[PDB]
Design a protein around this ligand. Structure first.
Ligand code: ZU7
Length: 435
Protein backbone atom coordinates (compact mmCIF):
# COMPACT_ATOMS: atom_id res chain seq x y z
CA UNK A 1 0.00 0.00 0.00
CA UNK A 2 2.88 2.35 0.90
CA UNK A 3 4.18 2.60 -2.72
CA UNK A 4 4.15 6.15 -4.12
CA UNK A 5 1.26 7.17 -6.47
CA UNK A 6 -1.37 4.90 -4.84
CA UNK A 7 -4.58 5.44 -2.84
CA UNK A 8 -5.92 2.39 -0.99
CA UNK A 9 -9.35 2.22 0.59
CA UNK A 10 -9.15 -0.10 3.65
CA UNK A 11 -12.80 -1.04 3.94
CA UNK A 12 -12.85 -3.78 6.58
CA UNK A 13 -16.22 -3.98 8.42
CA UNK A 14 -16.88 -1.84 11.56
CA UNK A 15 -15.03 -3.36 14.52
CA UNK A 16 -12.66 -5.42 12.30
CA UNK A 17 -9.61 -3.76 13.93
CA UNK A 18 -8.61 -1.04 11.44
CA UNK A 19 -7.60 1.43 14.18
CA UNK A 20 -6.15 -0.86 16.89
CA UNK A 21 -4.62 -3.70 14.79
CA UNK A 22 -3.96 -2.53 11.21
CA UNK A 23 -2.91 1.11 11.89
CA UNK A 24 0.14 0.20 14.15
CA UNK A 25 1.44 -2.27 11.47
CA UNK A 26 1.15 0.43 8.77
CA UNK A 27 2.99 2.92 11.04
CA UNK A 28 5.85 0.47 11.77
CA UNK A 29 6.32 -0.24 8.05
CA UNK A 30 6.20 3.54 7.23
CA UNK A 31 8.95 4.23 9.86
CA UNK A 32 11.02 1.27 8.50
CA UNK A 33 10.86 2.87 4.99
CA UNK A 34 11.59 6.41 6.23
CA UNK A 35 8.25 7.74 4.98
CA UNK A 36 7.29 11.17 6.44
CA UNK A 37 3.66 10.26 7.45
CA UNK A 38 0.51 11.98 8.70
CA UNK A 39 -2.31 10.17 10.58
CA UNK A 40 -5.67 12.04 10.61
CA UNK A 41 -8.16 11.41 13.42
CA UNK A 42 -11.80 12.69 13.06
CA UNK A 43 -12.06 13.84 16.74
CA UNK A 44 -9.95 14.31 19.91
CA UNK A 45 -11.58 11.15 21.35
CA UNK A 46 -10.22 9.08 18.40
CA UNK A 47 -6.80 10.84 18.70
CA UNK A 48 -6.58 9.62 22.34
CA UNK A 49 -7.63 6.05 21.39
CA UNK A 50 -4.96 6.03 18.65
CA UNK A 51 -2.25 7.01 21.19
CA UNK A 52 -3.16 3.91 23.24
CA UNK A 53 -2.89 1.68 20.11
CA UNK A 54 0.41 3.29 19.01
CA UNK A 55 1.99 3.65 22.51
CA UNK A 56 5.77 3.16 22.33
CA UNK A 57 5.98 4.09 18.62
CA UNK A 58 7.65 7.42 17.77
CA UNK A 59 4.55 9.52 16.83
CA UNK A 60 4.34 13.35 17.24
CA UNK A 61 0.88 14.24 18.62
CA UNK A 62 -0.22 17.61 17.26
CA UNK A 63 -3.32 17.75 19.48
CA UNK A 64 -4.01 18.82 23.11
CA UNK A 65 -6.04 15.57 23.54
CA UNK A 66 -2.80 13.64 24.27
CA UNK A 67 -0.41 14.71 27.07
CA UNK A 68 2.79 13.78 25.20
CA UNK A 69 5.55 16.26 24.30
CA UNK A 70 7.48 15.52 21.10
CA UNK A 71 11.17 14.61 21.28
CA UNK A 72 12.27 15.30 17.68
CA UNK A 73 12.89 11.62 16.88
CA UNK A 74 9.46 11.43 15.08
CA UNK A 75 8.76 11.31 11.34
CA UNK A 76 5.02 10.37 11.90
CA UNK A 77 2.61 13.22 12.85
CA UNK A 78 -0.95 12.68 14.21
CA UNK A 79 -3.60 15.42 14.18
CA UNK A 80 -7.36 15.87 13.64
CA UNK A 81 -8.88 16.14 10.12
CA UNK A 82 -9.83 19.81 10.89
CA UNK A 83 -6.29 20.67 12.10
CA UNK A 84 -4.74 19.38 8.82
CA UNK A 85 -7.04 21.54 6.70
CA UNK A 86 -6.63 24.52 9.02
CA UNK A 87 -2.80 24.37 8.84
CA UNK A 88 -3.01 24.07 5.01
CA UNK A 89 -5.12 27.28 4.91
CA UNK A 90 -2.92 29.23 7.40
CA UNK A 91 0.45 30.82 6.42
CA UNK A 92 2.36 27.97 8.06
CA UNK A 93 4.25 25.27 6.13
CA UNK A 94 2.80 21.79 6.26
CA UNK A 95 5.29 19.06 5.28
CA UNK A 96 4.65 17.37 1.90
CA UNK A 97 3.88 13.95 3.56
CA UNK A 98 4.97 10.83 1.62
CA UNK A 99 2.17 8.76 3.21
CA UNK A 100 -1.24 10.18 4.27
CA UNK A 101 -3.50 8.02 6.45
CA UNK A 102 -7.07 9.14 7.15
CA UNK A 103 -8.98 7.21 9.86
CA UNK A 104 -12.85 7.34 9.76
CA UNK A 105 -12.48 8.58 6.18
CA UNK A 106 -16.30 8.70 5.73
CA UNK A 107 -16.57 11.99 7.77
CA UNK A 108 -18.65 14.53 5.76
CA UNK A 109 -17.75 17.76 7.64
CA UNK A 110 -16.34 20.31 5.11
CA UNK A 111 -12.74 20.16 6.47
CA UNK A 112 -12.70 16.33 6.15
CA UNK A 113 -13.99 16.42 2.52
CA UNK A 114 -11.39 19.11 1.72
CA UNK A 115 -8.59 17.00 3.35
CA UNK A 116 -9.58 14.00 1.14
CA UNK A 117 -9.56 16.21 -1.96
CA UNK A 118 -6.12 17.64 -1.24
CA UNK A 119 -4.60 14.22 -0.38
CA UNK A 120 -6.21 12.40 -3.38
CA UNK A 121 -4.96 15.19 -5.72
CA UNK A 122 -1.37 14.75 -4.41
CA UNK A 123 -1.67 10.98 -5.08
CA UNK A 124 -3.04 11.69 -8.64
CA UNK A 125 -0.04 13.99 -9.23
CA UNK A 126 2.28 11.06 -8.37
CA UNK A 127 3.69 12.84 -5.29
CA UNK A 128 2.36 10.75 -2.41
CA UNK A 129 0.57 7.57 -1.22
CA UNK A 130 -2.64 7.51 0.84
CA UNK A 131 -4.76 5.06 2.84
CA UNK A 132 -8.39 5.99 3.62
CA UNK A 133 -9.70 3.74 6.45
CA UNK A 134 -13.49 3.30 6.63
CA UNK A 135 -16.05 0.49 6.49
CA UNK A 136 -18.33 2.84 4.45
CA UNK A 137 -16.50 4.54 1.55
CA UNK A 138 -18.18 7.34 -0.47
CA UNK A 139 -21.09 5.98 -2.52
CA UNK A 140 -21.61 2.79 -0.44
CA UNK A 141 -25.14 1.40 -0.87
CA UNK A 142 -24.99 -1.22 1.92
CA UNK A 143 -26.57 -0.13 5.25
CA UNK A 144 -26.09 -3.63 6.78
CA UNK A 145 -22.38 -4.58 6.62
CA UNK A 146 -20.71 -7.48 8.43
CA UNK A 147 -20.11 -7.23 12.21
CA UNK A 148 -18.06 -9.12 14.89
CA UNK A 149 -21.28 -10.73 16.19
CA UNK A 150 -24.79 -11.19 14.73
CA UNK A 151 -27.13 -8.19 15.10
CA UNK A 152 -30.98 -8.32 15.36
CA UNK A 153 -32.16 -5.76 12.75
CA UNK A 154 -35.78 -4.55 13.21
CA UNK A 155 -37.67 -1.90 11.20
CA UNK A 156 -39.97 -0.14 13.72
CA UNK A 157 -41.62 3.31 14.25
CA UNK A 158 -39.18 5.31 16.44
CA UNK A 159 -40.47 8.33 18.45
CA UNK A 160 -39.11 11.77 17.50
CA UNK A 161 -41.10 13.65 20.21
CA UNK A 162 -42.07 12.95 23.85
CA UNK A 163 -44.63 10.13 24.08
CA UNK A 164 -47.13 8.82 26.63
CA UNK A 165 -47.94 5.40 25.05
CA UNK A 166 -47.34 3.05 22.08
CA UNK A 167 -43.54 2.62 22.46
CA UNK A 168 -43.24 0.33 25.51
CA UNK A 169 -40.25 -1.52 23.88
CA UNK A 170 -38.11 1.62 24.30
CA UNK A 171 -38.38 1.78 28.10
CA UNK A 172 -38.97 -1.95 28.85
CA UNK A 173 -35.28 -2.65 27.99
CA UNK A 174 -32.83 -3.31 30.82
CA UNK A 175 -29.52 -2.75 28.96
CA UNK A 176 -27.78 0.32 27.50
CA UNK A 177 -28.98 2.14 24.36
CA UNK A 178 -27.35 4.58 21.96
CA UNK A 179 -30.09 6.63 20.20
CA UNK A 180 -29.33 8.68 17.09
CA UNK A 181 -31.49 11.83 16.68
CA UNK A 182 -31.50 14.35 13.76
CA UNK A 183 -30.76 17.46 15.86
CA UNK A 184 -29.76 18.76 19.28
CA UNK A 185 -33.27 20.23 19.86
CA UNK A 186 -34.89 16.87 18.99
CA UNK A 187 -32.55 15.06 21.42
CA UNK A 188 -33.37 17.52 24.25
CA UNK A 189 -37.10 16.57 23.97
CA UNK A 190 -36.44 12.81 23.87
CA UNK A 191 -33.90 13.06 26.73
CA UNK A 192 -36.42 14.98 28.92
CA UNK A 193 -39.09 12.33 28.24
CA UNK A 194 -36.65 9.51 29.20
CA UNK A 195 -35.45 11.36 32.34
CA UNK A 196 -39.07 11.92 33.47
CA UNK A 197 -39.56 8.11 33.08
CA UNK A 198 -36.64 7.41 35.49
CA UNK A 199 -33.84 6.78 32.94
CA UNK A 200 -30.24 8.08 33.21
CA UNK A 201 -29.43 9.99 30.01
CA UNK A 202 -26.22 11.50 28.55
CA UNK A 203 -26.50 13.83 25.49
CA UNK A 204 -23.75 14.18 22.83
CA UNK A 205 -23.36 16.77 20.02
CA UNK A 206 -20.39 18.29 18.08
CA UNK A 207 -19.94 21.17 20.56
CA UNK A 208 -20.18 19.05 23.71
CA UNK A 209 -18.56 15.78 22.41
CA UNK A 210 -15.15 15.46 24.27
CA UNK A 211 -16.52 16.59 27.65
CA UNK A 212 -19.78 14.63 27.61
CA UNK A 213 -18.28 11.50 25.95
CA UNK A 214 -16.07 10.99 29.07
CA UNK A 215 -19.31 10.55 31.11
CA UNK A 216 -20.10 7.37 29.11
CA UNK A 217 -16.91 5.84 30.67
CA UNK A 218 -17.05 7.50 34.17
CA UNK A 219 -20.67 6.82 35.22
CA UNK A 220 -23.61 4.43 34.77
CA UNK A 221 -26.16 5.35 32.13
CA UNK A 222 -29.26 3.84 30.49
CA UNK A 223 -29.33 5.96 27.29
CA UNK A 224 -26.94 8.06 25.24
CA UNK A 225 -28.88 10.53 22.97
CA UNK A 226 -26.56 11.67 20.16
CA UNK A 227 -26.44 13.47 16.82
CA UNK A 228 -24.54 12.00 13.80
CA UNK A 229 -21.11 12.95 15.36
CA UNK A 230 -21.11 9.51 17.07
CA UNK A 231 -20.78 7.86 13.58
CA UNK A 232 -17.05 8.86 13.72
CA UNK A 233 -15.36 6.12 15.76
CA UNK A 234 -17.20 6.67 19.06
CA UNK A 235 -17.26 3.41 20.99
CA UNK A 236 -19.82 2.50 23.61
CA UNK A 237 -20.43 -0.58 25.77
CA UNK A 238 -24.00 -0.86 24.58
CA UNK A 239 -26.41 -3.63 23.54
CA UNK A 240 -28.91 -1.62 21.47
CA UNK A 241 -28.94 1.21 18.92
CA UNK A 242 -32.25 3.06 18.26
CA UNK A 243 -31.87 4.92 14.96
CA UNK A 244 -34.39 7.54 13.79
CA UNK A 245 -32.61 7.17 10.35
CA UNK A 246 -32.97 10.97 10.05
CA UNK A 247 -30.60 13.93 9.80
CA UNK A 248 -30.70 17.67 8.94
CA UNK A 249 -29.27 18.80 5.58
CA UNK A 250 -27.81 22.33 5.17
CA UNK A 251 -28.93 23.64 1.79
CA UNK A 252 -27.90 26.87 0.08
CA UNK A 253 -31.00 28.55 -1.54
CA UNK A 254 -30.60 30.94 -4.50
CA UNK A 255 -26.91 31.30 -3.51
CA UNK A 256 -27.93 33.77 -0.76
CA UNK A 257 -29.09 31.93 2.42
CA UNK A 258 -28.57 28.56 4.13
CA UNK A 259 -31.44 26.61 5.66
CA UNK A 260 -31.37 23.37 7.65
CA UNK A 261 -33.79 21.18 5.61
CA UNK A 262 -35.51 18.15 6.96
CA UNK A 263 -35.26 16.05 9.01
CA UNK A 264 -34.72 13.72 6.07
CA UNK A 265 -33.28 10.22 5.50
CA UNK A 266 -29.64 9.47 6.27
CA UNK A 267 -27.25 8.02 3.66
CA UNK A 268 -26.52 4.26 3.63
CA UNK A 269 -22.98 5.05 4.94
CA UNK A 270 -24.43 6.89 7.98
CA UNK A 271 -26.99 4.15 8.68
CA UNK A 272 -24.24 1.50 8.53
CA UNK A 273 -22.01 3.51 10.97
CA UNK A 274 -24.94 4.14 13.39
CA UNK A 275 -25.79 0.41 13.37
CA UNK A 276 -22.02 -0.29 13.58
CA UNK A 277 -21.91 1.04 17.19
CA UNK A 278 -23.21 -2.43 18.31
CA UNK A 279 -22.43 -6.06 17.33
CA UNK A 280 -18.75 -5.26 18.08
CA UNK A 281 -18.17 -7.97 20.72
CA UNK A 282 -17.69 -11.47 19.20
CA UNK A 283 -18.69 -12.95 22.60
CA UNK A 284 -22.04 -11.04 22.86
CA UNK A 285 -24.33 -11.91 19.94
CA UNK A 286 -27.85 -10.47 19.72
CA UNK A 287 -27.26 -6.72 20.11
CA UNK A 288 -30.31 -4.91 18.68
CA UNK A 289 -30.60 -2.31 15.94
CA UNK A 290 -34.11 -0.69 15.74
CA UNK A 291 -34.47 1.59 12.71
CA UNK A 292 -37.26 4.07 11.91
CA UNK A 293 -36.98 4.85 8.21
CA UNK A 294 -35.21 4.17 4.93
CA UNK A 295 -31.93 5.56 3.45
CA UNK A 296 -31.50 8.09 0.62
CA UNK A 297 -28.73 10.01 -1.26
CA UNK A 298 -29.11 13.07 0.97
CA UNK A 299 -25.41 14.09 0.47
CA UNK A 300 -26.34 15.22 -3.12
CA UNK A 301 -26.80 19.04 -3.05
CA UNK A 302 -25.72 19.14 0.63
CA UNK A 303 -23.88 22.42 1.50
CA UNK A 304 -20.83 20.65 2.96
CA UNK A 305 -19.52 19.68 -0.51
CA UNK A 306 -19.84 23.29 -1.79
CA UNK A 307 -18.11 24.49 1.46
CA UNK A 308 -15.26 21.92 0.87
CA UNK A 309 -14.75 23.50 -2.62
CA UNK A 310 -14.57 26.98 -0.93
CA UNK A 311 -11.77 25.64 1.32
CA UNK A 312 -9.88 23.84 -1.54
CA UNK A 313 -10.01 26.89 -3.80
CA UNK A 314 -8.07 28.77 -1.04
CA UNK A 315 -5.33 26.17 -0.39
CA UNK A 316 -2.01 26.51 -2.22
CA UNK A 317 -1.12 23.39 -4.20
CA UNK A 318 1.33 24.42 -6.99
CA UNK A 319 1.22 27.85 -8.79
CA UNK A 320 -2.46 28.51 -9.77
CA UNK A 321 -3.42 24.78 -9.61
CA UNK A 322 -6.31 23.82 -7.40
CA UNK A 323 -7.07 20.47 -5.74
CA UNK A 324 -10.14 18.53 -6.90
CA UNK A 325 -12.58 16.71 -4.61
CA UNK A 326 -11.84 12.95 -4.19
CA UNK A 327 -13.43 11.34 -7.37
CA UNK A 328 -16.33 9.29 -5.76
CA UNK A 329 -17.63 12.46 -4.06
CA UNK A 330 -16.91 15.03 -6.80
CA UNK A 331 -20.49 14.95 -8.27
CA UNK A 332 -22.28 15.98 -5.05
CA UNK A 333 -21.98 19.72 -5.84
CA UNK A 334 -22.48 21.80 -9.01
CA UNK A 335 -19.35 23.93 -8.62
CA UNK A 336 -16.42 24.96 -10.85
CA UNK A 337 -12.86 24.49 -9.50
CA UNK A 338 -11.42 27.95 -8.69
CA UNK A 339 -14.72 29.92 -8.55
CA UNK A 340 -14.21 30.69 -4.81
CA UNK A 341 -10.45 31.57 -4.96
CA UNK A 342 -10.00 34.82 -3.00
CA UNK A 343 -7.32 37.53 -3.18
CA UNK A 344 -4.68 37.66 -0.38
CA UNK A 345 -6.39 39.99 2.16
CA UNK A 346 -9.88 38.55 1.58
CA UNK A 347 -8.45 34.99 2.01
CA UNK A 348 -6.95 36.01 5.34
CA UNK A 349 -10.33 37.41 6.51
CA UNK A 350 -12.04 34.16 5.36
CA UNK A 351 -9.63 32.07 7.43
CA UNK A 352 -9.96 34.24 10.56
CA UNK A 353 -13.81 34.26 10.37
CA UNK A 354 -13.67 30.43 10.52
CA UNK A 355 -10.76 29.98 12.96
CA UNK A 356 -11.45 32.76 15.49
CA UNK A 357 -15.00 33.70 14.45
CA UNK A 358 -16.24 30.07 14.51
CA UNK A 359 -18.59 30.89 11.58
CA UNK A 360 -19.77 28.23 9.10
CA UNK A 361 -17.58 28.10 5.94
CA UNK A 362 -20.37 29.43 3.66
CA UNK A 363 -21.10 32.42 5.89
CA UNK A 364 -17.37 33.24 6.41
CA UNK A 365 -17.00 33.24 2.59
CA UNK A 366 -19.91 35.68 2.03
CA UNK A 367 -18.43 38.18 4.49
CA UNK A 368 -14.80 37.91 3.25
CA UNK A 369 -15.78 38.05 -0.45
CA UNK A 370 -17.84 41.20 0.19
CA UNK A 371 -14.55 42.95 1.22
CA UNK A 372 -15.56 43.20 4.90
CA UNK A 373 -12.69 42.98 7.49
CA UNK A 374 -12.77 40.50 10.39
CA UNK A 375 -13.67 42.96 13.17
CA UNK A 376 -16.36 44.90 11.24
CA UNK A 377 -19.70 43.52 12.48
CA UNK A 378 -22.06 46.05 10.82
CA UNK A 379 -23.31 43.21 8.56
CA UNK A 380 -24.82 41.42 11.59
CA UNK A 381 -27.49 44.17 11.85
CA UNK A 382 -28.18 45.55 8.33
CA UNK A 383 -29.93 42.64 6.61
CA UNK A 384 -33.57 42.57 5.44
CA UNK A 385 -36.35 42.23 8.06
CA UNK A 386 -36.92 38.61 6.87
CA UNK A 387 -33.34 37.82 8.08
CA UNK A 388 -34.29 38.72 11.70
CA UNK A 389 -33.04 36.02 14.09
CA UNK A 390 -35.66 35.01 16.66
CA UNK A 391 -35.05 34.05 20.29
CA UNK A 392 -38.05 32.36 21.97
CA UNK A 393 -40.44 33.89 19.33
CA UNK A 394 -39.24 37.55 19.76
CA UNK A 395 -36.39 39.20 17.72
CA UNK A 396 -32.98 38.45 19.28
CA UNK A 397 -31.17 41.57 20.56
CA UNK A 398 -27.52 42.34 21.41
CA UNK A 399 -25.49 45.36 22.59
CA UNK A 400 -23.22 46.26 19.67
CA UNK A 401 -19.54 47.14 20.32
CA UNK A 402 -20.73 50.81 20.18
CA UNK A 403 -23.05 50.30 23.21
CA UNK A 404 -26.36 50.43 21.23
CA UNK A 405 -29.04 47.69 21.68
CA UNK A 406 -29.93 46.34 18.20
CA UNK A 407 -31.94 43.51 16.64
CA UNK A 408 -29.85 40.72 15.17
CA UNK A 409 -30.61 40.78 11.43
CA UNK A 410 -27.59 39.51 9.43
CA UNK A 411 -27.04 40.53 5.82
CA UNK A 412 -26.60 36.75 4.99
CA UNK A 413 -28.65 34.28 6.96
CA UNK A 414 -27.14 30.87 7.77
CA UNK A 415 -29.48 28.75 9.93
CA UNK A 416 -26.49 27.03 11.55
CA UNK A 417 -25.73 30.17 13.63
CA UNK A 418 -29.04 29.85 15.53
CA UNK A 419 -29.97 26.09 15.24
CA UNK A 420 -29.80 25.64 19.06
CA UNK A 421 -29.31 27.78 22.24
CA UNK A 422 -25.51 27.31 22.26
CA UNK A 423 -25.12 28.32 18.56
CA UNK A 424 -27.28 31.43 19.03
CA UNK A 425 -25.37 32.45 22.23
CA UNK A 426 -22.05 32.15 20.31
CA UNK A 427 -23.38 34.20 17.34
CA UNK A 428 -24.69 36.96 19.67
CA UNK A 429 -21.17 37.18 21.23
CA UNK A 430 -19.71 37.48 17.67
CA UNK A 431 -22.24 40.18 16.64
CA UNK A 432 -21.35 42.11 19.82
CA UNK A 433 -17.61 42.11 18.89
CA UNK A 434 -16.66 39.81 21.80
CA UNK A 435 -14.27 37.68 19.68
O1 ZU7 B 1 -0.36 22.36 16.88
C1 ZU7 B 1 -0.28 21.75 17.94
C2 ZU7 B 1 -1.44 21.69 18.92
N1 ZU7 B 1 -2.61 22.41 18.48
C3 ZU7 B 1 -3.36 21.66 17.46
C4 ZU7 B 1 -4.59 22.44 16.98
N2 ZU7 B 1 -4.75 23.71 17.71
C5 ZU7 B 1 -4.75 23.49 19.17
C6 ZU7 B 1 -3.49 22.73 19.61
N3 ZU7 B 1 0.82 21.09 18.36
C7 ZU7 B 1 2.06 20.88 17.70
C8 ZU7 B 1 2.90 19.93 18.25
C9 ZU7 B 1 4.10 19.62 17.63
C10 ZU7 B 1 4.43 20.28 16.48
F1 ZU7 B 1 5.62 20.00 15.89
C11 ZU7 B 1 3.63 21.23 15.91
C12 ZU7 B 1 2.41 21.51 16.52
Amino acid sequence: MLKKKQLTVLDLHPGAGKTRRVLPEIVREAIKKRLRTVILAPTRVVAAEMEEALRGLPVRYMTTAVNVTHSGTEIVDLMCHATFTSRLLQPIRVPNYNLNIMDEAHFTDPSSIAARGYISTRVEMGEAAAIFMTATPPGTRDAFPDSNSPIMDTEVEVPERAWSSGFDWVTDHSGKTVWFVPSVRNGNEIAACLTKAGKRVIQLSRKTFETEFQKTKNQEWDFVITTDISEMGANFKADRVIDSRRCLKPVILDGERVILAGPMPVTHASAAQRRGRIGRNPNKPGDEYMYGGGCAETDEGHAHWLEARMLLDNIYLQDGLIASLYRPEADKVAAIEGEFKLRTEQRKTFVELMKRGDLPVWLAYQVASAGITYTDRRWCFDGTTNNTIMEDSVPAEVWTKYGEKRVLKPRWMDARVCSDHAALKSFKEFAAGKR
